[PDB]
Write a protein that binds this ligand. Sequence first.
Ligand SMILES: O=C(O)[C@H](O)[C@@H](O)[C@H](O[C@@H]1O[C@H](CO)[C@H](O)[C@H](O)[C@H]1O)[C@H](O)CO
Ligand SMILES: O=C(O)[C@H](O)[C@@H](O)[C@H](O[C@@H]1O[C@H](CO)[C@H](O)[C@H](O)[C@H]1O)[C@H](O)CO
Lengths: 134, 134
Amino acid sequence: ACGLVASNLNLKPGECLRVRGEVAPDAKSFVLNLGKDSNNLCLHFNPRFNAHGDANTIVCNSKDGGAWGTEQREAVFPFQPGSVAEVCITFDQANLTVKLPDGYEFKFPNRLNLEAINYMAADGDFKIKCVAFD
Amino acid sequence: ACGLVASNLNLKPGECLRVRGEVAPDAKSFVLNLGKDSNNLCLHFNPRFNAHGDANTIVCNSKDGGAWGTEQREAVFPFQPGSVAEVCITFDQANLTVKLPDGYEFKFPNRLNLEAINYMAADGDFKIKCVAFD
Ligand SMILES: O=C(O)[C@H](O)[C@@H](O)[C@H](O[C@@H]1O[C@H](CO)[C@H](O)[C@H](O)[C@H]1O)[C@H](O)CO
Ligand SMILES: O=C(O)[C@H](O)[C@@H](O)[C@H](O[C@@H]1O[C@H](CO)[C@H](O)[C@H](O)[C@H]1O)[C@H](O)CO
């Protein structure tokens, strides 16, 4: 919405999307959105340092034809304000797999049954430095 | 564009944009477009392997409010079909500096009044593997 927006990614099941960015020193929250377009997101990835009453919590959700799905809250938080963070994402028909710094990872269901990821957007307190496709 | 489209790049003067991609084995042409949007390009970078009657020539141009400017052709063509190529681009108010594989570097005048570069699009026989902001 205000950070980097990319489309025509043509990311296929099995392929690895790597994103490296800078976490603001005064970070409250940042967002990575993945999906078909801005209205159809298979992953809304929202680490909240201190936002919406949440402290040190990753919130995940989907968006289907403009409507948000049910929020899932993760158990882990390997992010520090004022540091460099890398996130790696892959997916298949059933699940997205998100790999985090310090060896953490979680799965989030592929609620939209997407077979290609064509859209990515960053927002909030995260400056993208590098994007790569493996 | 069938290729990657990126917006909100916020590339400022003196900053370096690095693009790595695979050139198709039967490549005829590829395009990197940089500017404000699809109608307003401070750089249209178009290596022609075999297109528009041209052979192994880099064609550069600008686009201003939908109108193509005066074409310039460069003297070197350090691109091989079926290989990986990195291109680095910096800019200031006067010129864009394009650094090519095999060390060659050329300048293309900045014909637009751009404070920052916010838009990038790739097209043709070039598959983007990595984008980095430096
Ligand atoms: O605080 C809550 O539990 C509440 O459900 C909020 O998380 C929620 O906020 C939105 O969640 C979305 C993801 O599900 C996005 O992160 C939005 O940016 C965020 O506003 C509420 O629906 C509104 O406060
Ligand atoms: O052959 C020429 O010299 C002539 O100028 C062609 O290069 C020109 O082609 C267009 O050049 C643009 C950049 O200046 C873009 O690359 C367009 O895609 C391309 O068609 C002629 O207009 C071709 O009819």
